[PDB]
Amino acid sequence: MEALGADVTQGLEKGSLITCADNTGARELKVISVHGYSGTKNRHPKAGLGDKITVSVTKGTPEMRRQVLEAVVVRQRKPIRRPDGTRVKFEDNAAVIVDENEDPRGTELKGPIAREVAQRFGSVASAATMIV
Amino acid sequence: PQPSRPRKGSLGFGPRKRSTSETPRFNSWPSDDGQPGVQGFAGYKAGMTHVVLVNDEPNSPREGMEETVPVTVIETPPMRAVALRAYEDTPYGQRPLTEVWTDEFHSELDRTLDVPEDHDPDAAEEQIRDAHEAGDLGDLRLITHTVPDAVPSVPKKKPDVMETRVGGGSVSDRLDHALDIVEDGGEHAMNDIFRAGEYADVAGVTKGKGTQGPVKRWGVQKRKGKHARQGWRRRIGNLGPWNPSRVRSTVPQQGQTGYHQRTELNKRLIDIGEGDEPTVDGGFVNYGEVDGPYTLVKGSVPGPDKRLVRFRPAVRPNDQPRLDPEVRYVSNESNQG
Amino acid sequence: RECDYCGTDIEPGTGTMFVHKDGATTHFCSSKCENNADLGREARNLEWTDTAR
RNA sequence: CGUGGAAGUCUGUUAGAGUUGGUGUCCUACAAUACCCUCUCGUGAUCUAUGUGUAGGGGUGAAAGGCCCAUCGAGUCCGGCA
RNA sequence: GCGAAAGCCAAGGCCUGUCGGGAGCAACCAACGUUAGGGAAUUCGGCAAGUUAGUCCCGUACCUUCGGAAGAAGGGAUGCC
RNA sequence: GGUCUUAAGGUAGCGUAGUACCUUGCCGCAUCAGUAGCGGCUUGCAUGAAUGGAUUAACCAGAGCUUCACUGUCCCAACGUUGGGCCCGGUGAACUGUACAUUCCAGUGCGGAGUCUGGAGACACCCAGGGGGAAGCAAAGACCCUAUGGA
RNA sequence: CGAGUGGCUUGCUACCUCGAUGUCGGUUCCCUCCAUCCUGCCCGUGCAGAAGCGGGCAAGGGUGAGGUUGUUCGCCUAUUAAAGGAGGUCGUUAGCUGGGUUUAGACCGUCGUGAGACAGGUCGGCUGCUAUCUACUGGGUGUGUAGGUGUCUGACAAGAACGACCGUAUAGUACGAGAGGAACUACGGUUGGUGGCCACUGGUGUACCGGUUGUUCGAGAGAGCACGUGCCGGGUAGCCACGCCACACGGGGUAAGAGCUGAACGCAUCUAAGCUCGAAACCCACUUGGAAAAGAGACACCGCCGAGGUCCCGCGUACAAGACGCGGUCGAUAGACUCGGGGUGUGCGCGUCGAGGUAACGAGACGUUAAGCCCACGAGCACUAACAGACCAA
Ligand SMILES: [Cl-]
Ligand SMILES: [Cl-]
Ligand SMILES: [K+]
Ligand SMILES: [Mg+2]
Ligand SMILES: [Mg+2]
Ligand SMILES: [Mg+2]
Ligand SMILES: [Mg+2]
Ligand SMILES: [Mg+2]
Ligand SMILES: [Mg+2]
Ligand SMILES: [Mg+2]
Ligand SMILES: [Mg+2]
Ligand SMILES: [Mg+2]
Ligand SMILES: [Mg+2]
Ligand SMILES: [Mg+2]
Ligand SMILES: [Mg+2]
Ligand SMILES: [Mg+2]
Ligand SMILES: [Mg+2]
Ligand SMILES: [Mg+2]
Ligand SMILES: [Mg+2]
Ligand SMILES: [Mg+2]
Ligand SMILES: [Mg+2]
Ligand SMILES: [Mg+2]
Ligand SMILES: [Mg+2]
Ligand SMILES: [Mg+2]
Ligand SMILES: [Mg+2]
Ligand SMILES: [Mg+2]
Ligand SMILES: [Mg+2]
Ligand SMILES: [Mg+2]
Ligand code: NA
Ligand code: NA
Ligand code: NA
Ligand code: NA
Ligand code: NA
Ligand code: NA
Ligand code: NA
Ligand code: NA
Ligand code: NA
Ligand code: NA
Ligand code: NA
Ligand code: NA
Ligand code: NA
Ligand code: NA
Ligand code: NA
Ligand code: NA
Ligand code: NA
Ligand code: NA
Ligand SMILES: [Sr+2]
Ligand SMILES: [Sr+2]
Ligand SMILES: [Sr+2]
Ligand SMILES: [Sr+2]
Ligand SMILES: [Sr+2]
Ligand SMILES: [Sr+2]
Ligand SMILES: [Sr+2]
Ligand SMILES: [Sr+2]
Ligand SMILES: [Sr+2]
Ligand SMILES: [Sr+2]
Ligand SMILES: [Sr+2]
Ligand SMILES: [Sr+2]
Ligand SMILES: [Sr+2]
Ligand SMILES: [Sr+2]
Ligand SMILES: [Sr+2]
Ligand SMILES: [Sr+2]
Ligand SMILES: [Sr+2]
Ligand SMILES: [Sr+2]
Ligand SMILES: [Sr+2]
Ligand SMILES: [Sr+2]
Ligand SMILES: [Sr+2]
Ligand SMILES: [Sr+2]
Ligand SMILES: [Sr+2]
Ligand SMILES: [Sr+2]
Ligand SMILES: [Sr+2]
Ligand SMILES: [Sr+2]
Ligand SMILES: [Sr+2]
Ligand SMILES: [Sr+2]
Ligand SMILES: [Sr+2]
Ligand SMILES: [Sr+2]
Ligand SMILES: [Sr+2]
Ligand SMILES: [Sr+2]
Ligand SMILES: [Sr+2]
Ligand SMILES: [Sr+2]
Ligand SMILES: [Sr+2]
Ligand SMILES: [Sr+2]
Ligand SMILES: [Sr+2]
């Protein structure tokens, strides 16, 4: 994919439960897979800020629950490194549900978003309120 | 059916034994192109700091912007090309033919060598030129030594001697170039060979770690779960199958780790200066203060502080040289903390 | 930049920036400042802090 | 509401008894059954000391062919016996 | 302190749960302490480790042989002067 | 089948069971995905009434399943602590030992060889190590058969 | 229907082994095979493109994570370039595991008059040893080549040291009515693997500084014990990964394949002789080891009464012994001291305040105090200690 513009230490794995930072009706997501990733024997597939991931809805509205959807990682607790050397970390781990074309399923995004994610997924960015 | 998985560690850096010479020995040199010149230099590792640079990469989205880059400070004072050795081409490969020495020797070169008292530079030279007329001249290299005495942070005064190839135009032009350098006294500097912004291959003997087990030495796993509580934690599964009935040298086993020669490729030289600009507050931990000829190498360099490291024009660069990077800032903040 | 906690100048190419839940931002010069903040201590109440002194 | 203080009653490394798991330590042992942590019981069909009784096709057995002096689907010793 | 509990200390006893000396003392093993982010993905199996915890107040479901379930759960409090 | 063996011919209940071979039975729940678990169905290879059936509050170091919380079980390992380990003084065993023995790759051989054959490799000795091989050591198997053996 | 190859399944035999060679599956770690799943290069197509489908060369590298089940297998889920298969005593318990199998206890169904049984199900249920040899990973001592110092050579040896993907420009272009929709090439990044490094981020840090519970030393001060820190907070050096750096381009020869020239056979023919090209594969390039390479190496200088070396002493860029490296007054090698640079967080004492309380007393607050305490780092500095001195050597 297009270079992120920052070095990331993946803070998530297959099975991690994260926040769904949007208004789709899904409150909690479970990471199932990481797009374009291939690990190694015994290694838990890892995902981090900027990665597109296949996800499962653990908490939310009845219609949304149990649905297997795609999403983009917007925030993570494990630090990332920006070109000037500063590390950047968030209060939580969050992803935004996205469709086949990478357009957010929801109308509004909840909480801040990393600028690096904003540049990679333009439509996800346009829906953002705060881009840090 | 049992998942695949690459083996533990590379078999290309073996055997994993203690290095014979603490002073690195390049096993290859650059190609012969433009003006003749010494194909290497050397210095002493001091420590690290960071630097803020302006992006040079024309294909980078960040071209022209501030970028923080890690830097290893290496004290690179002037060395002495004390002799010119010539190799002749024989059916058994290259072999030393003769050497042309000088008169001016550093005050403490006698701590390592038996300095010449009676030598004939003209007979050696004559022999060399005659070998060239015959077309048997293999290649030309300079016996070089460092001046540890010029580096206060380094305890030794006993110079470190290494041979550095001279490459360049035609053999005649570089034979003459070599002799000129040597005759003076052999004094040359990092500036004479390298330009800030170029790529160098750095060689050095790694930090010693004595004996270490398979986990640290080869990167094998530790026993997992219940297998970690029975009496085996950091020991591998088995030394091999029933047959062949012998242990193959390829199985990850315990032994000397560290203190091996390594040659790291494509190390961009960020800045070649002199003085105390890169030095750190309180002094480089376990080293001392820098205030003299230095070289800022991008990233890490093999070996501990005080060890002799060697430079060589990159033999296999991936990128084109983007000379003299703009250094906006050089961290001097204490390394303690 | 100054550390939003202690007040000293953050050495360029150093430190971390914490992004709060409400989108706010806190530039920390070091782990020490972060740790003291996590304990609920206010910079002005710590004598060693530039803010305090 | 109080009083009362029952219980093969609860908690409990009180004394005391026992031993689920670690398949930990040990495994030419400290030890021919040990060590540590965890764990169970602890007013009763409880635990415990000494004395006393039951003897080998016989005892004893809330029964596992368990136990009857490191040995028991028939003890040990000597003899039958080379 | 509820206590014949822990922990600390007397009286009393001991340095004999009887080989020592040396190396910042490596690998490896036995017992342990601390580990970012993820949080059972490990394993036949949460095995191992951990989480909880004392006391007071509030509050407490299904089911029930009406005894019990029950310290259910869940919530709050706790020092010193 | 719409009686016959041999007396009767399975009632209440329970049921894919610690009993169901077929079997991962079918439907559903739960999970991203559940040979598991639970609910229902059930003709039960081969349930069933003190050979006790069903059911059950309470109890349990009894078997299985799920959830919340938690964590180095794991991703993937790191650093540290104490005792060993290593070196030195002293003390000082045992196991094991047909012989020879620096082996390796193939082959051959009672078909699973350090010792035979052909090659390859191989200067001697010593320290530390984890244990591939010596079909390593420890026991005239813990499986099977045999004996005009035993209990 | 016919002919074969393998030795992965099963069966057959009874040749080896029962004074005992530890079953299945998994795990860990190493090597290999090719009948190739991906990746490279090709051919055909019911090949427009994109994508398929089938076939060829090719074993360099890769082939992963999860849900039921002990499972191997298989079914299932989401990822993927692809998530190939097989051999090594169905590799791998003097490595691990005990979940399957297969002792002694027990239950169920079925069978049996019964004791008991089952190629059925089920709960519980034991794994010893200090390595002699050989093997290999690393470390030494000697001999040989045959006075010393320094520098090299390179026979051989090891490597995957690099594999793969996504994205952008090419380009909404070629192609196609449209729908759809490429490539060469140049760039940016990711992933797996590899080697090294600590400025940055993170972990540790039983150095250290602080807070604080119980108890003991009468209080205060300052301490011991509460496991190798009582507990909690911070954390230097160092070590680390979750952090950071680096890991080609190009040659040469080929396979499959595409062709040239070309005859046997006047023609034709990529082939018979010759030749131009052409794979991630082969060789070189790159990294690592390597004078014990018995043809036992090369060069320069020093020395044979003295070059060099040893013991010794101060130490670490080194280290389990040994080895290695540096300094020894022609000196900054280690320590003391003083600065610098760091860690903690404001010392003892005294003064003011302080809810109150006749008072005694008083938790605590402020000031003195950017305090006090401490430092495995640096600098300065010969103050102390590297002294004295013994010896080998052509
Ligand atoms: Cl393991
Ligand atoms: Cl996945
Ligand atoms: K047998
Ligand atoms: Mg696995
Ligand atoms: Mg540091
Ligand atoms: Mg800091
Ligand atoms: Mg009695
Ligand atoms: Mg963690
Ligand atoms: Mg698994
Ligand atoms: Mg537990
Ligand atoms: Mg059922
Ligand atoms: Mg009846
Ligand atoms: Mg027998
Ligand atoms: Mg027998
Ligand atoms: Mg038997
Ligand atoms: Mg018979
Ligand atoms: Mg009989
Ligand atoms: Mg036979
Ligand atoms: Mg055997
Ligand atoms: Mg083939
Ligand atoms: Mg291969
Ligand atoms: Mg096997
Ligand atoms: Mg074995
Ligand atoms: Mg064993
Ligand atoms: Mg053993
Ligand atoms: Mg079982
Ligand atoms: Mg019985
Ligand atoms: Mg069992
Ligand atoms: Na053990
Ligand atoms: Na075996
Ligand atoms: Na009453
Ligand atoms: Na026990
Ligand atoms: Na008897
Ligand atoms: Na004694
Ligand atoms: Na019946
Ligand atoms: Na009981
Ligand atoms: Na741990
Ligand atoms: Na062995
Ligand atoms: Na055949
Ligand atoms: Na096995
Ligand atoms: Na291949
Ligand atoms: Na499975
Ligand atoms: Na076997
Ligand atoms: Na075993
Ligand atoms: Na096994
Ligand atoms: Na080629
Ligand atoms: Sr295997
Ligand atoms: Sr060299
Ligand atoms: Sr070489
Ligand atoms: Sr064990
Ligand atoms: Sr064999
Ligand atoms: Sr009781
Ligand atoms: Sr009790
Ligand atoms: Sr057990
Ligand atoms: Sr334990
Ligand atoms: Sr013990
Ligand atoms: Sr035992
Ligand atoms: Sr009582
Ligand atoms: Sr007896
Ligand atoms: Sr007799
Ligand atoms: Sr006393
Ligand atoms: Sr004694
Ligand atoms: Sr700590
Ligand atoms: Sr689990
Ligand atoms: Sr699981
Ligand atoms: Sr509570
Ligand atoms: Sr009926
Ligand atoms: Sr032979
Ligand atoms: Sr051993
Ligand atoms: Sr082939
Ligand atoms: Sr292909
Ligand atoms: Sr099988
Ligand atoms: Sr099956
Ligand atoms: Sr078992
Ligand atoms: Sr079965
Ligand atoms: Sr059975
Ligand atoms: Sr000889
Ligand atoms: Sr494109
Ligand atoms: Sr279109
Ligand atoms: Sr203590
Ligand atoms: Sr506590
Ligand atoms: Sr051809
Ligand atoms: Sr030699």
UniProtKB/Swiss-Prot annotation, chain A:
InterPro entries: Ribosomal_uL14, Ribosomal_uL14_arc, Ribosomal_uL14_CS, Ribosomal_uL14_sf. The keyword rRNA-binding applies. GO terms for cellular component: cytosolic large ribosomal subunit. GO terms for biological process: translation. The keyword Lipid metabolism does not apply. Transmembrane segments: none annotated. Keywords: Ribonucleoprotein, Ribosomal protein, RNA-binding, rRNA-binding. GO terms for molecular function: large ribosomal subunit rRNA binding; structural constituent of ribosome. SMART domains: Ribosomal_L14 (SM01374). Pfam families: Ribosomal_L14. It comes from the Archaea. The L3/L14/L24e cluster may contact the 16S rRNA in 2 intersubunit bridges. Part of the 50S ribosomal subunit. Forms a cluster with proteins L3 and L24e. Forms part of two intersubunit bridges in the 70S ribosome. Binds to 23S rRNA. Belongs to the universal ribosomal protein uL14 family. This is Large ribosomal subunit protein uL14. It comes from Haloarcula marismortui (strain ATCC 43049 / DSM 3752 / JCM 8966 / VKM B-1809).
Curated annotation (Swiss-Prot), chain B:
The keyword Ribosomal protein applies. One of the primary rRNA binding proteins, it binds directly near the 3'-end of the 23S rRNA, where it nucleates assembly of the 50S subunit. Part of the 50S ribosomal subunit. Forms a cluster with proteins L14 and L24e. Interacts weakly with protein L13. GO terms for cellular component: cytosolic large ribosomal subunit. Residues 21-30, 246-258 have a biased composition (Polar residues). The gene is rpl3. Belongs to the universal ribosomal protein uL3 family. It comes from Haloarcula marismortui (strain ATCC 43049 / DSM 3752 / JCM 8966 / VKM B-1809). One of its GO terms (biological process) is translation. Residues 1-43, 150-169, 205-258, 311-337 are annotated as: Disordered. PANTHER family: 60S RIBOSOMAL PROTEIN L3-RELATED, LARGE RIBOSOMAL SUBUNIT PROTEIN UL3. The keyword Cell membrane does not apply. Keywords: Ribonucleoprotein, Ribosomal protein, RNA-binding, rRNA-binding. Coiled coil: none annotated. It holds the Pfam family Ribosomal_L3. This is Large ribosomal subunit protein uL3. PROSITE patterns: RIBOSOMAL_L3. InterPro entries: L3_arc_euk, Ribosomal_L3_dom_3_arc_sf, Ribosomal_uL3, Ribosomal_uL3_arc, Ribosomal_uL3_CS, Transl_B-barrel_sf. Residues 219-236 have a biased composition (Basic residues). One of its GO terms (molecular function) is rRNA binding.
From Swiss-Prot, chain C:
One of its GO terms (cellular component) is ribonucleoprotein complex. GO terms for biological process: translation. Its cofactor is Zn(2+). Disulfide bonds: none annotated. Binds 1 zinc ion per subunit. Signal peptide: none annotated. A zinc finger (C4-type) spans 3-33. Keywords: Metal-binding, Ribonucleoprotein, Ribosomal protein, RNA-binding, rRNA-binding, Zinc, Zinc-finger. Zn(2+) binds at residues 3, 6, 29, 33. GO terms for molecular function: rRNA binding; structural constituent of ribosome; zinc ion binding. Residues 44-53 have a biased composition (Basic and acidic residues). Binds to the 23S rRNA. Belongs to the eukaryotic ribosomal protein eL24 family. Part of the 50S ribosomal subunit. Forms a cluster with proteins L3 and L14. This is Large ribosomal subunit protein eL24. The lineage of its organism: Archaea, Methanobacteriati, Methanobacteriota, Stenosarchaea group, Halobacteria. The chain holds residues 5 to 57 of 67 of the full protein.
